Amino acid sequence: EEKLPKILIVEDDERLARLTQEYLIRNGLEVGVETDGNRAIRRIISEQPDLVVLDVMLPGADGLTVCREVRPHYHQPILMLTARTEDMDQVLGLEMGADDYVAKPVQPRVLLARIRALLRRTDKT
Amino acid sequence: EKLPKILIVEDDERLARLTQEYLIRNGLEVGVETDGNRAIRRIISEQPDLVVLDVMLPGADGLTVCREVRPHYHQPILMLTARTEDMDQVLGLEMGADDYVAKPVQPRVLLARIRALLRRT
Numbered sequence: 001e002e003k004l005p006k007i008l009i010v011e012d013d014e015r016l017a018r019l020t021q022e023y024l025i026r027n028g029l030e031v032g033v034e035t036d037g038n039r040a041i042r043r044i045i046s047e048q049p050d051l052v053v054l055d056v057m058l059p060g061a062d063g064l065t066v067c068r069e070v071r072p073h074y075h076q077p078i079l080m081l082t083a084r085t086e087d088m089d090q091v092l093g094l095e096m097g098a099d100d101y102v103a104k105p106v107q108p109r110v111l112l113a114r115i116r117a118l119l120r121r122t123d124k125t
Numbered sequence: 126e127k128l129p130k131i132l133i134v135e136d137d138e139r140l141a142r143l144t145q146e147y148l149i150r151n152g153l154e155v156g157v158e159t160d161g162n163r164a165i166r167r168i169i170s171e172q173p174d175l176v177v178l179d180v181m182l183p184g185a186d187g188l189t190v191c192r193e194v195r196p197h198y199h200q201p202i203l204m205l206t207a208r209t210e211d212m213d214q215v216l217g218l219e220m221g222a223d224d225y226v227a228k229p230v231q232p233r234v235l236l237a238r239i240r241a242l243l244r245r246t
């Protein structure tokens with residue numbers, strides 16, 4: 001056995017989510033994919049991933065609603081990764097409980113480094 | 126009340142001051158250091174709750190500052206720099222920074238990122 005950090009990607013662009021998933025798996029992470037916001041809420045709470053990569057514009061429940069609903073029962077890092085790149089969007093996402101806010105398109109190594117920085121802070125806490 | 130203590134490490138003195146004044150107006154206690162070697166000693170001595178860290182600095186660059194304070198300073202470090210290449214950002218985070226923000230940053234974004242890091246303390 002070998003327990004890797006568990007990542008959940010929440011992203012409704014299915015191909016994009018999969019390409020991101022494959023990259024992160026090649027870099028020492030165990031990664032699942034969820035494409036619906038309401039499914040993501042229940043899955044985050046029950047599966048308790050070590051970190052969530054969270055899209056904002058989602059069917060069922062947008063990323064801000066996801067944060068509101070999971071944060072009472074889920075305390076691990078949330079990294080928002082979204083095409084909603086305006087300053088107000090970033091402030092709102094962070095104020096709603098996201099620990100990082102990353103603009104699409106993100107360079108794969110940057111996304112990986114930002115994930116690792118959040119996991120490091122948690123593990124050192 | 127006890128305000129969060131922030132240290133801005135930035136060699137552009139005017140920029141450091143404008144950033145300082147904005148953060149003070151938003152409930153933070155903020156000091157300014159302009160030299161990298163002075164920052165190392167000051168960070169370890171004063172133990173601010175968060176450091177806003179420039180990279181290109183006299184005396185010691187921000188990556189060196191991060192390296193040398195981390196054994197004695199575990200609080201969040203937010204790098205804020207004009208070194209915006211992808212390799213620069215990855216290296217800064219791998220060096221021990223918690224966040225890496227490109228200049229010019231909008232003040233409200235900077236404030237929100239500082240608060241996001243302080244939430245985790």
Ligand code: BEF
Pocket residue numbers: 055056057058081082083084104
């Ligand atoms: F649909 Be995500 F907000 F880019």
Ligand code: BEF
Pocket residue numbers: 179180181182205206207208228
């Ligand atoms: F001099 Be800093 F890196 F913008």
Ligand SMILES: [Mg+2]
Pocket residue numbers: 011012013055056057058
């Ligand atoms: Mg979407």
Ligand SMILES: [Mg+2]
Pocket residue numbers: 135136137179180181182
């Ligand atoms: Mg400088």
